[model samples]
Target: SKGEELFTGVVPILVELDGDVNGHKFSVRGEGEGDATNGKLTLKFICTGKLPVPWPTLVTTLVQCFSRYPDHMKRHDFFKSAMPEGYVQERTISFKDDGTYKTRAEVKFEGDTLVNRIELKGIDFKEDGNILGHKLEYNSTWGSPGWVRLALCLTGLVLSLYALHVKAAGTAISCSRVFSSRWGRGFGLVEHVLGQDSILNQSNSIFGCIFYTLQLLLGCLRTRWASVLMLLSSLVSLAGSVYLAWILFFVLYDFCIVCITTYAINVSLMWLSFRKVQENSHNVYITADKQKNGIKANFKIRHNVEDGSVQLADHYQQNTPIGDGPVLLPDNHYLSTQSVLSKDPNEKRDHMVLLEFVTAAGI
Candidate 1:
């Protein structure tokens, strides 16, 4: 068919309208957002108390509003249609609830609506007393989010310190013979990846300080920030690490202590971030799972106190809410991990008494 509606199962999401569609005076208050990947749409704080648009006109305006995000709606010839070069066209963007400061060009582009005086700026925040999310734990054998964050931050700090020490202690730059060879192409590559003026840039210890501080905030404050930012940073590190590996193997081929160690930390961060994210999501998710047996079992896997692994109380483990973790492991708890290397209750000896309880005859 030459003509057809391009979208199916479409819905009209409310928008805090701004920038008049047909030269009608506009006032905007609210934010509209959609996530095609995740089935969540938020039309937050819409205030339409003041408007002079007619019904039919208002309806058309709604259609035009959604077209900002193409997937949200579609035109008859969407792909074939030329995208507007006009800066006045509606642009879909992530609207941070916190105030936004768009620069010269990007300012008007965020919302094509004219006549703006911070309609959505009613929200305010206090100093360090600001509040957003809730308290949750990043429980693992290695430790909590705070612990992992501090480790990475401190590790970065140490790297920055070591790098600084090397650079400063040497009266002259340490130039490798490998760098002096092959028209210095290898050196150029190194410079791009690890350039100079770095004290104020990438190679600076202060940079590491800032990174860890923010990550610390993310971890300490119960927000998606930790998982989201950590996931992103770790992924970037892994990519760089992979490339660094390739460079080391082919270009001069030697151990890059910095790169190797950085990769190790990135791997650890990835491991920690994913586990914490799992915990975060499951905080609201695994609370009420129906087991095969009719009996309800609230489960939380204990981080083997010092072993850096999960202490399995049973043959199977389910990630339940922290409050739901079995308070008691029955002596009859059947946990049989058939592995020689495992803590393998079949064999495990320990020596310690944080709280000595030699209670056979009330000794």
Candidate 2:
């Protein structure tokens, strides 16, 4: 009876006759009670066309069947088999209302063709043919609206802040206002579980903030460490998130909505992490280097005595022990003006040649 459109009792499969032949939109309401174990649930579909009802489907809800039953357990998410054609049955089920029970196969086609589906949630059949705690509900398309994935993440951020604040002030508003009577706190089981001892509220939002930021960093930057961080975080988050979902839904049956939102964000992030890896799987990558090897500088320097001329090539690098124009390093008794100019090696050059043909020092 969860409404976007309300329905009562059992709503059978629909048939749309192409030309309209007095289409019947009929439903019935009745109440009855019985007690029997191991009853038979058979489904049938009526179609005017000879083509086998186009697509006929049948489904069953959560019940027990495994190594233990009727004695060791009250309910099960197991599926042994179904009656009638036996070839067409599903096993559409959930251990609890969380909608996460595992099974053999799932439907790929439209489930709308399932007329005469008598599935009910949390009901068990006894050995003598009777149902216990029987109630019926037609499936509702109750799913999060668009962009809810992102909203759930942001909500996680907000909830983290809120959880930490409440942890600090001790006077903050909490989920305990309505649904937390047994939890004995202003919050749900999550805060109750992790709130008492953590100095900064170990369930602190700051941790989440850090994780999300690093996750964002990983998305933008690609390197070895980023890759490792994302992969490890993905695995841990996925496993932890699943375990906690089962914890809240299975163990306690009551968890905070904000906590659920945060968990959803974790799920979404986990998916994104693995997907990031897959998208990059085609190419191998590694960190890059920034420094480049440079060419070494080497050459020679020459000294002259009379009107020395030095040569310097632009393309070559030289450090003459001091290679400028060798001006007055010690004023060589009388050194001539000399300069290092740009030129070629083959050109005739003037040097301070030691021409020592002094005739008695020109006395």
**For this target, which candidate reaches the highest lDDT against the unseen true structure?**
1
RMSD of each: 25.5, 42.8
Expressed as tens digits, the lDDT of each residue in 1-363 for candidate 2 is 011011112222221222111131222111111111221112222232221100101111111111111322222111112111111122222222212211222211123222222222222223121111112211212222223324545566676677655545533233433123423232234455666654544443566666665665555443457657887876776665566557557666665676677677887877766654554321111111112111112222221111111111111211111111111111101101111112234423221111111000000
Off by over 4 Å in 1: 1-148, 168-210, 282-363
In every candidate, how many clashes are there?
3, 13
Which parts of model 2 are misplaced by more than 4 Å? 1-155, 170-201, 283-363
lDDT of 1 by residue, 1-363 (tens): 011122122332333444332233445343334322222233333224333322211211221111222231222212112111111222121113221111111111123321112211112222221111211112222233445557776786676466545544532232232223331232234445656443433332344345556555565543466568877766655665565556555776654465456557667766776776664311101122234211121222222222222222111122111222122111111111110111123322221011101100100
- Look at candidate 2 and tell me the lDDT of residue 227: 56
lDDT of 1 at 284: 8
| Candidate 1 collision pairs | 18-113, 19-113, 19-114
Q: Which ten contiguous residues of candidate 2 have the minimum total lDDT?
A: 354-363
